[PDB]
Symmetry: D3
């Protein structure tokens, strides 16, 4: 509707195979503003937050069905995943649980903000 | 020689034109391990730290001569910059000042670490 | 069926974000012959005409549903548009109105022609 | 289920238009192990064999419906074919006829094998 | 220095092999404003005009030395040409003969103009 | 001068990181005819033979200086290698030793041949 946020993350298997550039770029080219980032340490992981109108449903469509075997080429699991264990990434589930996800990972100051062009 | 670090950053004009995916990927494909990331707010900026043997001279070669007019296609300023004012990025200058740069921006815990494959 | 023509165009928002290369190439790689081009001046716009068997339905499938929110990644609105106001391009609607569109924009001589390989 | 094989091949029209790199890479990036290759001489052709869990249905989804006019952008016929005569490639049909196809083209020794990472 | 123009063109062999998308995009991504286009009919050809500070020397560096055998990968002849007969394109020679080239091909009205972002 | 051959090969580290598509395509896009292929089994390896006028010096320029630290972005070692141990590939050394290399690996029949377009 306006200025809604959502939460993506990159599982240990993505990071390890060299995919962090690829994911980030697909979000840039759609039009969505990036607003916080960091890494953390099984294996390591990358956390982010993306802002624009509908970022919630759009994200889910970019990623592809959660069971690789069901997803479509053109999407991220469609071009790179094979099983549900090793499925490369997680994206925020609903315009509610965006918050329980964000607020549980990102302290107040970390989130920046600015106007685009 | 081994396990040396260096410091890249993405200027406000890069970020604004949608280049953060592109830069990150060129580092992934050469072989170098990524080890910390964050954003900050003129305009916003992205900070990183990359680890492997020679990451210092390699980085400089990936970016291209500081005066766009002098740099070569195939590199980052060669494919995307036109003048020295608006030149997209900064990369660490020497195996010394890597530190004065890192330590001045990144607190102890932020830097992670792990073994690759 | 044979040697049918159609009419694509690039809205002011496409042109402004730097997409004219991208669109043109997707038509080249499918197999379709290009046969006229020009630019014009809100904002500026790019006009074209493409020839082969079925170019009409194929074009529509390459572009994606007119409401970005409905279209699929892999297509042009799927990878780059977010709302219906700012939806990047227009493609010819039917094997009839191809003409009312062409003939209304392109004078007799402008249309070239040649044999391929 | 485990360690199943399948058989892809590249028709004379693919080879002639310069597509052998493109096809091979789409298989590499999904995760599947390559295990034999060769060429042969109408026109010439390229034969291969790919191994992992489900390689059979996955292959078919990567290629797209056999009638170009029916297939979806993001897939190989979706991005490059126009008619059913000149449709670029053939991929193995079922977990049975994988064999009648393989064994009819590839002598015992040609098939290699190794462990991945 | 400011707002200088230059003249690129695409030879019959480029056009025929499917390169018009590729060339145009390399100019878009550097930063230069596009300002007129058309096609014409041996074989057909594509004409253009590009505007920004230094577009003259930059163009020449993007294309590569005129003798393919001498040019460097990363540039247009470096990635696609083999001999000097069949060398894909022509780019304007000097900030003078930009004019004798432009004015000899493009009537007054065809050249548009606009402000960017 | 005409119809000279040369010999490329892909080391175990290339194959393992998923590069066989990438290499092959760079040869396709320059213009050179492919004429034999196979695989073999430390680790496995891929062998090939490429034909056109000057394929010998061109190949060497596409690959980059043998010491990664010396080579230039835009080339294959420039974009992907870091040390001389793990340097991804080998390409034929001179218009003589093309033969001692070819003939030592490829039996008479394996080499095909055909006319292009």
């Amino acid at each position: 509707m306006s200025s809604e946020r959502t939460f993506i993350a990159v599982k240990p298997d993505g990071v390890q195979r060299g995919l962090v550039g690829e994911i980030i770029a697909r979000f840039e080219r759609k039009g969505y503003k990036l607003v916080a980032l960091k890494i953390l340490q099984s294996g390591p992981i990358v956390c982010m937050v993306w802002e624009g109108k509908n970022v919630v449903k759009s994200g889910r469509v970019l990623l592809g069905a959660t069971n690789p075997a069901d997803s479509q080429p053109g999407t991220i699991r469609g071009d790179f995943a094979v099983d549900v264990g090793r499925n490369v990434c997680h994206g925020s589930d609903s315009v509610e649980s965006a918050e329980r996800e964000i607020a549980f990972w990102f302290k107040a100051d970390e989130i920046a903000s600015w106007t685009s062009h």
